Structure 1
Amino acid sequence: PGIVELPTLEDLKVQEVKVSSSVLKAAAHHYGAQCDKPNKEFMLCRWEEKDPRRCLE
């Protein structure tokens, strides 16, 4: 019943963060303090839409 829609692989292409987990943990506090606005916007969108396909941007 119905056909699922999935974004094309060109829509999932982005410059990945290629640092390991320890590097991320070292600067986790400053990253959370400085980069808070896009992270919070993304997480609110994720919790409200309940759909990974509506939060690519």
Structure 2
Amino acid sequence: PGIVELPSLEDLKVQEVKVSSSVLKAAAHHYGAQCDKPNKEFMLCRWEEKDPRRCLE
């Protein structure tokens, strides 16, 4: 069958949010307040098209 296409590590490297789970859970509501206006573009992309390797931008 037709083989799969995957993006290489020339693109899959964003500087990660290297904080742990405690502070990331504690800072939740203000993260929803100031930011998370443009994340719904990402989440709508992910729910309309069921394909990661598409909405990675």
Q: TM-score, normalised by structure 1?
A: 0.92
Q: Provide Cα deviations, 1:5-35, integer angstroms capped at 9, x if missing partner.
A: 0001111010100001111011100001111
The 4+ residue runs of structure 1 with deviation greater than 3 A are none
Distance 1:20 1:9 in 2: 24
Aligned-pair identity (%) = 98
Q: Which runs of no fewer than 5 residues in structure 1 stay unpaired?
A: none
- Length, aligned pairs only: 57
Alpha carbon RMSD of aligned pairs, Å?
0.8
| Cα deviation, residue 37, structure 1 | 1.6
Q: TM-score, normalised by structure 2?
A: 0.92
| Bigger RCO (CA 8 Å, 6+ sep) | 1
